[PDB]
């Protein structure tokens, strides 16, 4: 009946960024006041609409995109933006209607011994189109002459985040939730 926004914001485990999770919220009366009355969720930037006029739409497909990218990688979650995360990890269209509610989660997602549990692909020959999920799991390798293993010019694409608790705000695991009203 009400909106399972706490089952996403107030959830325990998110997904890996290269294969980010995407939960579809529906049929709920979204009380945005729980997140709009004050500012506990850091950046609250809405692209195209206003926070005060959020009730004048229809909840056809509100795709609450849940993932952990980085502190200074939320800037690459803007419409018409390019970068390492935007080219091929998660691409947002130029004409994008939605909001970004990224909030810090340093204490929840960290490990003194090293939280090597969140992966992003680093090298790619091509680029990916918007409105396209990345759920397939092929295996790739580098160029020059065909090779095997981490040789002279051959590298493993998916490399892991450290996520030790004492990082800076720009590298701390900001749990980013992106709403795409469509």
């Amino acid at each position, epitope marked *: *009946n*009400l909106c*399972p926004f*706490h*089952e996403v914001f*107030n*959830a325990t485990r998110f997904a890996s960024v290269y294969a980010w999770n995407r939960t579809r919220i529906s049929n709920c009366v979204a009380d945005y006041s729980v997140l709009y009355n004050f500012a506990p969720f850091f950046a609250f930037k809405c692209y195209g609409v206003s926070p005060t006029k959020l009730n004048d739409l229809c909840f056809t497909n509100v795709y609450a995109d849940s993932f952990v990218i980085k502190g200074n990688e939320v800037s690459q979650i803007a419409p018409g933006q390019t970068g390492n995360i935007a080219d091929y990890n998660y691409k947002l269209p130029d004409d994008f209607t939605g909001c970004v509610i990224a909030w810090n989660s340093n*204490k*929840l997602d960290s490990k003194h011994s090293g939280n090597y549990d969140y992966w992003y692909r680093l090298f790619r020959k091509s680029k990916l189109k918007p409105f396209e999920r990345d759920i397939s799991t092929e295996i790739y390798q580098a160029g020059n002459k065909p090779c095997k293993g981490k040789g002279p010019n051959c590298y493993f694409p998916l490399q892991s985040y450290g996520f030790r608790p004492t990082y800076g705000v720009g590298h701390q695991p900001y749990r980013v939730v992106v709403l795409s009203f469509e």
Partner: antibody
Amino acid sequence: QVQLVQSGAEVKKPGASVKVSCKASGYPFTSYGISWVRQAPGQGLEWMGWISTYNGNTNYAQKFQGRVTMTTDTSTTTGYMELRRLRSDDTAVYYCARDYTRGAWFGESLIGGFDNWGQGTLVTVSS
Amino acid sequence: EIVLTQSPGTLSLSPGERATLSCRASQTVSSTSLAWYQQKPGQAPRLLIYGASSRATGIPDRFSGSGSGTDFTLTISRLEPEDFAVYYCQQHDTSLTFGGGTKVEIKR
């Protein structure tokens, strides 16, 4: 203004089965579940199970893997827990907390804990 | 089936000291799945710390919690007479299990 109306004491005997009542009030019913915790006299708390009132999913502990069942009432926002094959050591005080430890719809998990508790229910079983 | 083995057993203190309780797990437990409770004698427990860091609704400032991985702690700064109750620890990282409990008595 949180209210958790809970049933009274019982004097049942071994060999039968009983179900406990738990009326909650003051919150959106379908956005949360109901958990149950059992505490024997002069003992510590031990988990019994978890149930979501949204989709009817359940989750029981291995110690009571099959000996127990949980039902819910949506009209009265009332939770239930039914235990079977009452043993001599089954005498305890049963509590009915409010779930914020696992999501109702999604069911994955939530960062929280049992936030609102009832009054307790002493069920004494003896021959 | 992580065992929490709450320690110590009882706790008798004076009206004004500092209170501290421990809950130590066998395996590694995520900090997002541990909570605390306070049970007054004859009543039901009530949540104090959820998420191992946050404070529950209506809980005064003298209550605090921390811990991650294998060791967790509850902290009370001032000991008013109502701060003598029964406490427990909980985890739901992998299945839901409780602690042994720690009664808080009055030292005289």
